[PDB]
Amino acid sequence: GSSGSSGTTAKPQQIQALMDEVTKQGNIVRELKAQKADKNEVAAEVAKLLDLKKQLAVAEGKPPEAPKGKKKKSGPSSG
């Protein structure tokens, strides 16, 4: 197998990787329901998706579903 390092990490870099995930995910979830996938199997991806949207938007700068949804509040960082 591969040992040592798996590339380098960056702010503007990881983003490019996420974007792809947001797309692929959305699809994976669509097919899951289209094939009557197990409620458990689907849920798994579901949650992940909701996270991707954030890890993507936030990274860029936009707030995570700030305006969308009531429960999800801006909740800024303090430190």
UniProtKB/Swiss-Prot annotation:
Location(s), subcellular: Cytoplasm, Cytosol; Nucleus, Nucleolus
PTM annotation (Phosphothreonine): residues: T8
Effect of mutating K36A: Slightly decreased enzyme activity
Effect of K33A: Strongly decreased affinity for tRNA
Domain WHEP-TRS: 14-70
Disease: Interstitial lung and liver disease: An autosomal recessive, life-threatening disorder characterized by respiratory insufficiency and progressive liver disease with onset in infancy or early childhood. Clinical features include failure to thrive, hypotonia, intermittent lactic acidosis, aminoaciduria, hypothyroidism, interstitial lung disease, pulmonary alveolar proteinosis, anemia, and liver canalicular cholestasis, steatosis, and iron deposition. Charcot-Marie-Tooth disease, axonal, type 2U: An axonal form of Charcot-Marie-Tooth disease, a disorder of the peripheral nervous system, characterized by progressive weakness and atrophy, initially of the peroneal muscles and later of the distal muscles of the arms. Charcot-Marie-Tooth disease is classified in two main groups on the basis of electrophysiologic properties and histopathology: primary peripheral demyelinating neuropathies (designated CMT1 when they are dominantly inherited) and primary peripheral axonal neuropathies (CMT2).
Subunit architecture: Monomer. Part of a multisubunit complex that groups tRNA ligases for Arg (RARS1), Asp (DARS1), Gln (QARS1), Ile (IARS1), Leu (LARS1), Lys (KARS1), Met (MARS1) the bifunctional ligase for Glu and Pro (EPRS1) and the auxiliary subunits AIMP1/p43, AIMP2/p38 and EEF1E1/p18. Forms a linear complex that contains MARS1, EEF1E1, EPRS1 and AIMP2 that is at the core of the multisubunit complex.
Family: Belongs to the class-I aminoacyl-tRNA synthetase family.
Functional note: Catalyzes the specific attachment of an amino acid to its cognate tRNA in a 2 step reaction: the amino acid (AA) is first activated by ATP to form AA-AMP and then transferred to the acceptor end of the tRNA. Plays a role in the synthesis of ribosomal RNA in the nucleolus.
Protein name as catalogued: Methionine--tRNA ligase, cytoplasmic
Organism: Homo sapiens (Human)
Taxonomy of the source species: Eukaryota, Metazoa, Chordata, Craniata, Vertebrata
Residues of the full protein shown: 835 to 900 of 900
